Design a protein around this nucleic acid. Structure first.
Ligand SMILES: Nc1ncnc2c1ncn2[C@H]1C[C@H](O)[C@@H](COP(=O)(O)OP(=O)(O)OP(=O)(O)O)O1
Ligand SMILES: [Ca+2]
Ligand code: NA
Length: 430
DNA sequence: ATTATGACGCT
DNA sequence: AGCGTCAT
């Protein structure tokens, strides 16, 4: 009734760059603009592995994880850009620097949480209140929302995409009560106005287009963002949730894309998020645990409380390389040479991080995989990181893993290593 | 022979 | 601490 919280206290946005690594390469090389193209890493094995795909190329069926040779079979005119290689490995520096460009722009509007190399959540609650004051009861015109979709509209009693978008926007704006500064729907709408401005600034100042979701929490904001891509933003209101969720497969919701989500489906015998509402909180907790159960009970009603954390910088800085099939490392000299290569890239990134961000990492984590293990990581060990020195770091990494060597022979390594990983963690101010 | 990352939960 | 899950 009157005491039933509806999770409508906040305005949250999720901004996500469209086909990000592709746009980085297209900005740099105009010849790739408005073409079917993809970004690939390595080239020798089947033309390289695809990691990003332009919307033009997606129309031909090109996807991430596809080998470039296979992609070319779907799209013979596909253009490719290669990830830079340094010290024998893929080097993602260019995309990390492009990411900083975008994060710094977003930070002018509001506190952001960096969720990945190319996306950030934004808590717009306070910014919305401020904009609501400036407006002073004055209505919101559709002209302020030129790329916004209202999920669930139009509805009730044109055959083109932009026409439908506008019809829905009009129905929404027609319904708004702008006299009430505390209407959640009004708050979301002002949120969307601000996000239009954020997205315009990003495109103006970097050249990169993006999509966005605006809702009352991170999970709905993320879901919304994906509903109309590319180059559009979507508002998902509290009211839209029952219909949206009624046919939404459980796996589409962030965190339910894996084993937990499969267990929800299997154990409860359901398919869609909306079907969760018929279980009690205790019932959900009995199957999925206390935390997951409470989260599910609220989430299926469109309610989630996870905060947008004030964090614009990554918490760890890591360097990793696979050594698949035949290229697995089988000699001590091999293992030491590759630890040094990884340690050298890591040193370079850490030193840059220390100058830019006024902090120093204090722990080095070392992880390997051995041939045979289905798991991505076989063994992880940490040691002290006391100096930004590649030789020391690689020497230390070797010391903490050297006992993994089954080989009776000193020089040989067995079983061969199929992955190496160095990660700097536990930052302190400096 | 996807690969290179990165956050957070469990015990 | 070391491992697993989920994500981009
Ligand atoms: N599995 C992966 N392996 C390596 N790099 C990845 C992987 N997934 C994503 N990336 C990189 C390349 C992407 O351009 C970038 C952002 O990822 P993501 O947001 O999932 O897709 P995207 O930006 O390429 O397309 P979209 O327009 O659908 O968001 O991070
Ligand atoms: Ca993206
Ligand atoms: Na993303």
């Amino acid at each position: 009734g009157p005491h039933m919280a509806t999770g409508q206290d906040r305005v949250v946005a999720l901004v996500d760059m469209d086909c990000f690594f592709v746009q980085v390469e297209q900005r740099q090389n105009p010849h790739l603009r408005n073409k079917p193209c993809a970004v690939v890493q390595y080239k020798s094995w089947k033309g390289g592995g695809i990691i990003a795909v332009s919307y033009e190329a997606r129309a031909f069926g090109v996807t991430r994880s596809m080998w470039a040779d296979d992609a070319k079979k779907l799209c013979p005119d596909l253009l490719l850009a290669q990830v830079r290689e340094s010290r024998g490995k893929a080097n993602l520096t260019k995309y990390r620097e492009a990411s900083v460009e975008v994060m710094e722009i977003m930070s002018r509007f509001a506190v952001i949480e960096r969720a990945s190399i190319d996306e950030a959540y934004v808590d717009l609650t306070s910014a919305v209140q401020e904009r609501l004051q400036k407006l002073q009861g004055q209505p919101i015109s559709a002209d302020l929302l030129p790329s916004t979709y209202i999920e669930g509209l139009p509805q009730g009693p044109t055959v083109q995409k932009e026409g439908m978008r506008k019809q829905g926007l009009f129905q929404w704006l027609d319904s708004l009560q702008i006299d009430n500064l505390t209407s959640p729907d009004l708050q979301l709408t002002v949120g969307a106005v601000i996000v239009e401005e954020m997205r315009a600034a990003i495109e103006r100042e970097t050249g990169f287009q993006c999509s966005a979701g605006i809702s009352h929490n991170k999970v709905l904001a993320k879901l919304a963002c994906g509903l109309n891509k590319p180059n559009r933003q979507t508002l998902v209101s509290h009211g839209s949730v029952p219909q949206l969720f009624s046919q939404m497969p459980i796996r589409k919701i962030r965190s339910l894309g894996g084993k937990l989500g499969a267990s929800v489906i299997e154990i409860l015998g359901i398919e869609y998020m909306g079907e969760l509402t018929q279980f009690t909180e205790s019932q959900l907790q009995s199957h999925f645990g206390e935390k997951n159960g409470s989260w599910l009970y609220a989430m299926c009603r469109g309610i989630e409380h996870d905060p947008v954390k004030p964090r614009q910088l990554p918490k760890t800085i890591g360097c990793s390389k696979n050594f698949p099939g035949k290229t697995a490392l089988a000699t001590r000299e091999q293992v030491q040479w590759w630890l040094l290569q990884l340690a050298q890239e890591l040193e370079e990134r850490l030193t840059k991080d220390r100058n830019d961000n006024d902090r120093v990492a204090t722990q080095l984590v070392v992880s390997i995989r051995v041939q045979g293990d289905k798991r991505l990581s076989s063994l992880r060990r940490c040691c002290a990181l006391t100096r930004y020195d590649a030789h020391k770091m690689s020497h230390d990494a070797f010391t903490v893993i050297k006992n993994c060597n089954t080989s009776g022979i000193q020089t040989e390594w067995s079983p061969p290593l199929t992955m190496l990983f160095l990660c700097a963690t536990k930052f302190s101010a400096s």
